[PDB]
Amino acid sequence: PRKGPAPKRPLVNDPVYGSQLVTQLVNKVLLKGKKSLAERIVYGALEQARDKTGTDPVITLKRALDNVKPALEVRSRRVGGATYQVPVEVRPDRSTTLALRWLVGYSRQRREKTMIERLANEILDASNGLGASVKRREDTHKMAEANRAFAH
Amino acid sequence: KKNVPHGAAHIKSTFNNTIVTITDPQGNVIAWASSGHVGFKGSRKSTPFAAQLAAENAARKAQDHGVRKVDVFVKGPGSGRETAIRSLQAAGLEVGAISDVTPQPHNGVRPPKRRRV
RNA sequence: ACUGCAGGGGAGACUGGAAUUCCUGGUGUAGCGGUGGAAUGCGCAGAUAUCAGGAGGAACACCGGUGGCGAAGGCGGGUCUCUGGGCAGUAACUGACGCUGAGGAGCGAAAGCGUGGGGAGCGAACAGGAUUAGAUACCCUGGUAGUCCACGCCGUAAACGGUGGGUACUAGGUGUGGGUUUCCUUCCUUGGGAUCCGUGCCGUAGCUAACGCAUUAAGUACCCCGCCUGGGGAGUACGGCCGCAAGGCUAAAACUCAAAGGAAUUGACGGGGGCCCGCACAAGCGGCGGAGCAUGUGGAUUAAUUCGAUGCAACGCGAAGAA
Ligand SMILES: [Mg+2]
Ligand SMILES: [Mg+2]
Ligand SMILES: [Mg+2]
Ligand SMILES: [Mg+2]
Ligand SMILES: [Mg+2]
Ligand SMILES: [Mg+2]
Ligand SMILES: [Mg+2]
Ligand SMILES: [Mg+2]
Ligand SMILES: [Mg+2]
Ligand SMILES: [Mg+2]
Ligand SMILES: [Mg+2]
Ligand SMILES: [Mg+2]
Ligand SMILES: [Mg+2]
Ligand SMILES: [Mg+2]
Ligand SMILES: [Mg+2]
Ligand SMILES: [Mg+2]
Ligand SMILES: [Mg+2]
Ligand SMILES: [Mg+2]
Ligand SMILES: [Mg+2]
Ligand SMILES: [Mg+2]
Ligand SMILES: [Mg+2]
Ligand SMILES: [Mg+2]
Ligand SMILES: [Mg+2]
Ligand SMILES: [Mg+2]
Ligand SMILES: [Mg+2]
Ligand SMILES: [Mg+2]
Ligand SMILES: [Mg+2]
Ligand SMILES: [Mg+2]
Ligand SMILES: [Mg+2]
Ligand SMILES: [Mg+2]
Ligand SMILES: [Mg+2]
Ligand SMILES: [Mg+2]
Ligand SMILES: [Mg+2]
Ligand SMILES: [Mg+2]
Numbered sequence: 001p002r003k004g005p006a007p008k009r010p011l012v013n014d015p016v017y018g019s020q021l022v023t024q025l026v027n028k029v030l031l032k033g034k035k036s037l038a039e040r041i042v043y044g045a046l047e048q049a050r051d052k053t054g055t056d057p058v059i060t061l062k063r064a065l066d067n068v069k070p071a072l073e074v075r076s077r078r079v080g081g082a083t084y085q086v087p088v089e090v091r092p093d094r095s096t097t098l099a100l101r102w103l104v105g106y107s108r109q110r111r112e113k114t115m116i117e118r119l120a121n122e123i124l125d126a127s128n129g130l131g132a133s134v135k136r137r138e139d140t141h142k143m144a145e146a147n148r149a150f151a152h
Numbered sequence: 153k154k155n156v157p158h159g160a161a162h163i164k165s166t167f168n169n170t171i172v173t174i175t176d177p178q179g180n181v182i183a184w185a186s187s188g189h190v191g192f193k194g195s196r197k198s199t200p201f202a203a204q205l206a207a208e209n210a211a212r213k214a215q216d217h218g219v220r221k222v223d224v225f226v227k228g229p230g231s232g233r234e235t236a237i238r239s240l241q242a243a244g245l246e247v248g249a250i251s252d253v254t255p256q257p258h259n260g261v262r263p264p265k266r267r268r269v
Numbered sequence: 270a271c272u273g274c275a276g277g278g279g280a281g282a283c284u285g286g287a288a289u290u291c292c293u294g295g296u297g298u299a300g301c302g303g304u305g306g307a308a309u310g311c312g313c314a315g316a317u318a319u320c321a322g323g324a325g326g327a328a329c330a331c332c333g334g335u336g337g338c339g340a341a342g343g344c345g346g347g348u349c350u351c352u353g354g355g356c357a358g359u360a361a362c363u364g365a366c367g368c369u370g371a372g373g374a375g376c377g378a379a380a381g382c383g384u385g386g387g388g389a390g391c392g393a394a395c396a397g398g399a400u401u402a403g404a405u406a407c408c409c410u411g412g413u414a415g416u417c418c419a420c421g422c423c424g425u426a427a428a429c430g431g432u433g434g435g436u437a438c439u440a441g442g443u444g445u446g447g448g449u450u451u452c453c454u455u456c457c458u459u460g461g462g463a464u465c466c467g468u469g470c471c472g473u474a475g476c477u478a479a480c481g482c483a484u485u486a487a488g489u490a491c492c493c494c495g496c497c498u499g500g501g502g503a504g505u506a507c508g509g510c511c512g513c514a515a516g517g518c519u520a521a522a523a524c525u526c527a528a529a530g531g532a533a534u535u536g537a538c539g540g541g542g543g544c545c546c547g548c549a550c551a552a553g554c555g556g557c558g559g560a561g562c563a564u565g566u567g568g569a570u571u572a573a574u575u576c577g578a579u580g581c582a583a584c585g586c587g588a589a590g591a592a
Contacts, residue, residue, distance in 0.1 A: 002546060075551090080305035081400095094552095101553095149192070149199045162319065168303065171318055179320030180296040186318080188300060195304070257288035258330045258346085261390045262416095268407060269305090 016043065017058050021065070024096070028104045029119075044116035049123055064126035068099040068133045072144035087144035087151060099133075106132045154217045156182065161222040161240060161247070163207075165230025168195075170203040172236055174214040174222060182217050185209035187232075203232020207239035214245075221246045227254040 014022045022042060030038040046057040053060060074085045090098070107122035108115070125131030156176045164171045173184040187202040190209055196202055214222070222240065224247050226233050241247055 001548095082306050097553095149196045149201045151201065160319090164318070166302095169301075169317095171301090173297090173318050175296080175319055178296090181319055182297085184297070184299095184318060186300075189298090195306070255288060256330065257328085258286070260287070260328055260330090261289045262328075262392095264391070 017046070019058050021058065021061060022046070024100055025061070025104075028100045029115075041115050041119065045119040045123065048117060048120040052120070053124065060127050061123060064103070064123050064133075065096065065099050067126050067129050068102055068131075068137050069095045070098060070137050070140045071095070072141065073098075074140065074143050074147065084150055085143065085147045087147050099137075102133045102136050106136070154182065156218055157220055159214065159219040159222045161210075161224045163224065163226045163233065163236045165203065165226065165228040165233040165236065167198060167229060169197045170206055170228075170230055170232045170236060172207050172210040172240075174210055174219060182219065183210050183213035185213055198231060200232045200235040203230070204235045204239035207232075207236040208243045211240050211243040211245050219245070221248065223248060224250040225253045226250065227252065229254075 011020050011023045011027075013020055014026070026035065026038045026042045029041055046061070049060050050057045070090055072087045073090050075088055076083060077086050103122055103126060104119070107119040110118045110122060112118045112121060122131055122133060126133045158177060159182060160175050160177060162173045162175065164173075169187050171184065171186040174182045176182065185206055187197040187206045190202060190205045192202045192205075222245055224237055224240070226237070237247060237250060
């Protein structure tokens with residue numbers, strides 16, 4: 001707004017996995033107020049990841065997030081008779097938000113059957129550095145790199 | 153295949169481009185990489201980023217010919233006028249002295265008319 | 270008249286350096302140039318860049334200002350030659366010889382014209398590119414006359430202080446240029462005071478429609494000159510004078526309008542300025558515009574399709590119930 005920043009809301013740890021990362025994940029998956037359904041989907045995805053890799057699911061999730069988190073975004077601006085992209089730094093919480101959004105958005109449009117297994121596959125591919133979520137981060141970094149001239 | 157231990161750096165920084173040329177103390181050019189020579193074109197050639205890229209290119213090309221220290225002569229109302237010096241410094245060269253040699257007429261030739269933009 | 274003083278006042282001759290352009294040569298390699306963004310353009314046959322040498326023209330950074338000089342237009346690189354005016358002091362000289370000035374004469378920015386020369390840069394016309402609906406423009410790349418010099422012509426400018434010349438008088442305050450001058454004469458201070466001549470700001474009386482002017486009057490008076498008489502038509506036609514031409518000067522009428530104007534006030538507006546705000550944008554989430562149906566409206570149709578609502582602020586609105 002115009003009158004400075006606004007207070008942001010706090011979140012509580014997830015009972016089964018004592019992290020706020022999975023709470024943010026369920027809040028990203030949540031639609032139409034179906035928070036129990038979103039929690040079911042996230043829990044099923046984490047369980048499938050654990051049963052397929054052996055590794056701790058929240059550790060796998062942190063690896064995937066570290067893979068997909070960006071560092072420079074490309075906010076657009078207009079100067080004269082032309083408008084061009086300006087690369088700016090990304091703050092950490094915005095980076096986590098954007099990475100989670102990318103994961104869920106790209107898993108929603110994967111060629112599989114249920115959202116649980118779609119999201120599990122997307123998380124595993126991101127942790128390995130293969131998925132479209134990682135491709136998105138790489139494209140963002142390339143566009144921020146190919147416009148360093150306009151770093152005013 | 154040359155070897156000139158001490159040289160001079162001329163940085164011409166205009167409103168539209170920047171050119172860095174490295175010469176021996178007698179005025180013979182060694183290497184000259186400029187902003188357009190580095191991959192750039194149009195109005196991007198005036199940005200300081202392009203200036204420092206051109207400065208790096210010229211500095212390394214001259215080091216390949218054996219230059220260790222350059223004296224700097226800058227001229228022009230450009231923006232990369234200091235970024236080029238900084239890149240010359242932190243690309244493996246020591247500069248020492250810096251001179252200003254922008255040509256100043258003693259009220260000589262008539263300039264072009266003022267733009268009514 | 271004498272003695273000092275300040276000055277880009279004027280004319281002529283010679284002469285200096287910075288820079289731009291070009292030419293010759295060296296180094297050197299792929300770009301340069303240009304814009305809001307580009308393209309035309311130049312270059313790869315060796316450009317731009319950089320170094321040395323050369324040619325040529327024009328304008329004179331710092332000093333430099335609000336400051337100086339000139340009747341005005343105008344005048345600044347330096348030196349020499351010739352030449353005009355101003356101020357102060359003295360009071361030596363003449364003894365009203367003054368002021369203004371119809372006509373007239375002279376000078377008079379720039380553009381323009383003639384004859385001859387010169388031509389770096391800039392740059393009407395002209396050409397291409399771009400923008401645009403178009404772009405005979407603005408922006409870009411080129412580019413002729415011209416701009417420069419000699420000798421003539423032209424005689425106009427918002428040629429402006431939008432204020433004719435001369436003279437006397439009517440509180441001050443505060444800068445700055447040129448003199449003279451006691452005293453404080455060292456208080457070295459080149460300060461203060463007094464006086465004369467300039468050039469600015471601010472202010473009383475007074476004046477003005479107001480804005481403002483205000484000892485440099487737009488105040489108080491006197492002398493002479495020019496000019497005005499509603500707005501257009503029109504500074505135009507015809508006649509004449511001048512000019513090579515462009516054109517300049519003197520200068521009407523018919524007809525037509527009931528206004529045209531000057532200052533200042535309140536608002537509104539601005540692709541003016543400053544500050545501030547709103548789901549205004551930004552960051553997000555979900556939609557509508559595509560499909561089927563419901564409802565309202567336009568149009569069409571009908572015997573009737575009752576009437577009203579019509580940008581935001583009419584259209585699931587009047588209608589919270591038309592067989
Ligand atoms: Mg002469
Ligand atoms: Mg030439
Ligand atoms: Mg050459
Ligand atoms: Mg050259
Ligand atoms: Mg007598
Ligand atoms: Mg007279
Ligand atoms: Mg007369
Ligand atoms: Mg004459
Ligand atoms: Mg002329
Ligand atoms: Mg002529
Ligand atoms: Mg002609
Ligand atoms: Mg001629
Ligand atoms: Mg030109
Ligand atoms: Mg032009
Ligand atoms: Mg054209
Ligand atoms: Mg006149
Ligand atoms: Mg004048
Ligand atoms: Mg007049
Ligand atoms: Mg008078
Ligand atoms: Mg008078
Ligand atoms: Mg005075
Ligand atoms: Mg009156
Ligand atoms: Mg006044
Ligand atoms: Mg009056
Ligand atoms: Mg006439
Ligand atoms: Mg006639
Ligand atoms: Mg008015
Ligand atoms: Mg306003
Ligand atoms: Mg938005
Ligand atoms: Mg829709
Ligand atoms: Mg629809
Ligand atoms: Mg109706
Ligand atoms: Mg409505
Ligand atoms: Mg409604």
